[PDB]
Ligand binder design. Structure first.
Ligand SMILES: [Cu+2]
Length: 128
């Protein structure tokens, strides 16, 4: 069984997927984020952040207020189920999280919190 996904965030402010499914039989799930392109992190940095859909807008708003020095994520945000760091182009970051943290009968979204990106870089995450 597959318990990981590889996702690209590129210089056109896009994730290459907007829907991720996690098999409920995985104990852990790994997101491998890569950022192809040629822009530095301070122009077009991308992260991958998972929260409930109801928490998403707040996560994003608080992350932009947190600023570039904090990867545009509030530190220790307890609305964040899992996150990569912010990466510039040519970089990669993976996050692994326990599938036991997703609730059956909750809605989840992933997104990038770099300012403005979540209009395009957002998607759903579901248990299969
Ligand atoms: Cu981004």
């Amino acid at each position: 069984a597959q318990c990981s996904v590889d996702i690209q965030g590129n210089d056109q402010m896009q994730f290459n997927t907007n829907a991720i499914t996690v098999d409920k039989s995985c104990k852990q799930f790994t997101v491998n984020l890569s950022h192809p392109g040629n822009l530095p992190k301070n122009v077009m940095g991308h992260n991958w952040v998972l929260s409930t859909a109801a928490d998403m807008q707040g996560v994003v708003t608080d992350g932009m207020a947190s600023g570039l020095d904090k990867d545009y994520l509030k530190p220790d945000d307890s609305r964040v189920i899992a996150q990569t760091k912010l990466i510039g182009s040519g970089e990669k970051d993976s996050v692994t999280f326990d599938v036991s943290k997703l609730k059956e009968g909750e809605q989840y979204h992933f997104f990038c919190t770099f300012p403005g990106h979540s209009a395009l870089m957002k998607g759903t995450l579901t248990l299969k």
